[PDB]
Structures are given as structure tokens and as C-alpha cells.
Amino acid sequence: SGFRKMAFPSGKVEGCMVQVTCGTTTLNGLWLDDVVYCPRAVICTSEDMLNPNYEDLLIRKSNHNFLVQAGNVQLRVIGHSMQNCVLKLKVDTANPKTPKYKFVRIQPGQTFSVLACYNGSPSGVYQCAMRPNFTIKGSFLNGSCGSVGFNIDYDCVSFCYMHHMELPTGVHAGTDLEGNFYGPFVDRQTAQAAGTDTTITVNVLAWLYAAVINGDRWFLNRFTTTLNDFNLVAMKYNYEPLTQDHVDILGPLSAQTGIAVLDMCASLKELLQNGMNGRTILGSALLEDEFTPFDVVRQCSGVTFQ
């Protein structure tokens, strides 16, 4: 029993974190086989922040300009190249700790673990979701650039995020590991802002199922609704539309608890229209949307506490 915002164990990723210094700029890199991946911003100059032609900046560089430190061992850079907004630094030593891994790009609404890092040294691990507006609500300070986000599947690390910058609202933007930004953001200090966000409806429903599995049932009711009437109310509360695929994905949870998806939707409708009236769900006084159906199944017992 119990439900927490759980991250993946970070060990496999800790063993790939290195420090990359170019000039007076230091940030984190990801060392996999004989390549170190890091934000290309490492080559940017303090005055170039506004608009840095990275192609020129990289042309002006040589391998010896990149200081790469794996803990106490310096790695010799033997090649450098740019891939969109990340830089690939070939080094003369393959990381003996390289896990099995993949570079995957995730969808808004999916979750992942973040290993926050400073000077190549892991600092903390936490879970979050890719927001509908392609930002993440992370916890990052200066120096965290190059920290990565990931999901672990049978000892295989799927890297999905590299941290690049903080937007004016204090939320965070970055790239996949091919260096392509999530959302309409660029690696220059401009007036870019997050667009309007929405709540991830399928996740809220998954979390309500988690709550039932854990014995919170006060929000349940005898009513059911149709997908369209539900989505009509969702729109009015700035919730993503619920699709039939979401209903299908919630199937297993619906079977475990005996509560049909459209019945749970009627509960969500009431909570949106009425609030929680003094009450909490799984320790929260807000409807939580950063737990996918998969996260719930993985964390929660296969047996419901009836």
C-alpha cells in the first residue's frame, strides 16, 4: 500500500555522468561508449548568449578546448561534432559502465526520471512529466545544464531528455538526446515563453484508480457519463480531451477495481464542478496529473484492497 511520486533507481545513469568544460563554462555530459553528449551551449560565449551562431563557434573550436572529466580521470577528446542542439565529443575511452540504452523521444503526458547533476556529480533524482506545452516543471539551478531524464525498462535506459534552460515562469525546457527541442524553444537567451498548459486527463483518471486501489473511495459516485458530455466538461476546466485509446489504456485499472472508465469520469466531473470540500486523495488536495496509467500499474498492487 501507499502511493508516492517514485523515480527509477538512478545508478545506471550516475555511471555515465561527466563534467564538460569549455572556456569558463562548465556543464554536465552523458558518456556512453566513446561519446560524450552535452548541450552545445557549452561553447557559447557570455556575450553570444543573445544570438550565438553555433556553427561558427564550433568551427573556431578544437578537440583540446574541451575539458572532459569523468570523476578523477580526464578523458581525451579525439573528435567533436554537432547534432542539432547537442554536441558529440568523441573520446579515446569507452565508458566501462555504459548500460544498455536507447535514445527515445517522449510524448506530452508521459513521465520520466530526472537525475539532477552539477559539475558532473549527481545531486538528486525526481520524477516528472512532459507537460502538454512541452515544458517540464523541474528543479534546476545554474550548472544543471546537461542533466538527463530517462525511463528504465528491464535494465535498458531509455534516455529522453537533456536539460538546456529555464523559461521566465521558472519552468524548464530541453531536448531529446538527438538534440531536438521539446516544444518551440531555442538554446539562446531570448524572450521565449511557455504557451498555455492543460491538465493531462488520462493521468488524473489513472491516479484516481490508484486512490481506489489504496482505499480512498469518497469521491466515487453511482453515476456514469458519455465520453462526449465528459469531454464537454473537461474542455471547460482546461483538461485534455479523453479519447477511446485512453479508455482502452485504462482498461486494466478499470478491471482491477471494477469501476468502469466512464464511471470514474463521472467522479472526475463532480470533483471538477464541486471541488474536494475539505478532503484529500492520496495525500493531495489537488487532482494530480503526473502519473501515467503505466506508472500506477507498476507501483500499485495487482490486487485491489476491496
Binding site: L27, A41, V42, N142, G143, C145, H164, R188
Partner: peptide, 9 residues
């Protein structure tokens, strides 16, 4: 007001 690249100097 303006975006912040989070390197370290």
C-alpha cells in the same frame, strides 16, 4: 523576463 541557459561559469 528572459530565458536562462543553466551552464556554470
Amino acid at each position: 523576463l528572459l530565458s536562462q541557459l543553466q551552464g556554470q561559469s
